[PDB]
Amino acid sequence: RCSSLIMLLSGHEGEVYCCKFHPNGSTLASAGFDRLILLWNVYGDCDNYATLKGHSGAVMELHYNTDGSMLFSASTDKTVAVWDSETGERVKRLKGHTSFVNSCYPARRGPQLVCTGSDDGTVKLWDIRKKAAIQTFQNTYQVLAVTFNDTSDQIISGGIDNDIKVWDLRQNKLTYTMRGHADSVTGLSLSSEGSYLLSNAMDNTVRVWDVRPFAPKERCVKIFQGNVHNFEKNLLRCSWSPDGSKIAAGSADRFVYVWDTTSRRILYKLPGHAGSINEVAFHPDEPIIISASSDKRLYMGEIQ
């Protein structure tokens, strides 16, 4: 067993584009095509204790700060909503993007900054007390996944420009371009220790880069196969294990993929889903995996 809780989560009315664990590990957030975030309990009978309405379009990216009280939600319409998790009312809207917002990310260490990316190309940063766009990094093409580093002083935007592009918050320029992908980069996730960063793209390959000031001049250290991207062209997301040992990239062939970081082999190829798997997440404390896919269902499960 090695946990406290394969039990299924049904109740999503359409696709689930993003699933995230609360960092305390007792509650759960999942959202997608429903314009409707569902808050589950991780243990117990896995009920749906709270619901978040306030998106006029589908929810592209759910995200939790390490505080875990406020939930960040990049939606399809033009907006990124900021919610609270206990009583569940949207404390803020963030309305500066002119197209479909594909991504958001919490700044967890310092001030609460929400770096977002959208289909216009603008990568916009969002302090919640400003109610405005702080800095807009103008990428010429669409960005599908954005994330901070551990320092929250750089933004790491992956998009359809075949390159992962990092922007410095003080230099306000693109510093270097992680080239080596052959299609649109859909999912970026960064470790709890913050040195390494996962990359999913429609070249049906997964990369690990090392976003760190110590530069090895070719940051593509680890290349993973097995993944596939299909005609549906979703935003196939990613996650890291909290011990940093396992990566998980969502795939288009209904199989929950979990690799080993060191071994570079597929540890887990899990069945059960029926559609393209958008986001697959990791529990903070115990080795539990939820997986979100287009089959309107979630699969919790003890990996170890």
Partner: peptide, 25 residues
């Protein structure tokens, strides 16, 4: 990649998300 195969690649994706996440779908 190229430039025209990164502008047509954006045109095919703008005309993908503009209709897939259209507010009538």
């Amino acid at each position: 990649m190229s430039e025209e195969k990164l502008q047509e690649k954006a045109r095919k994706w703008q005309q993908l998300q503009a209709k897939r996440y259209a507010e009538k779908r």
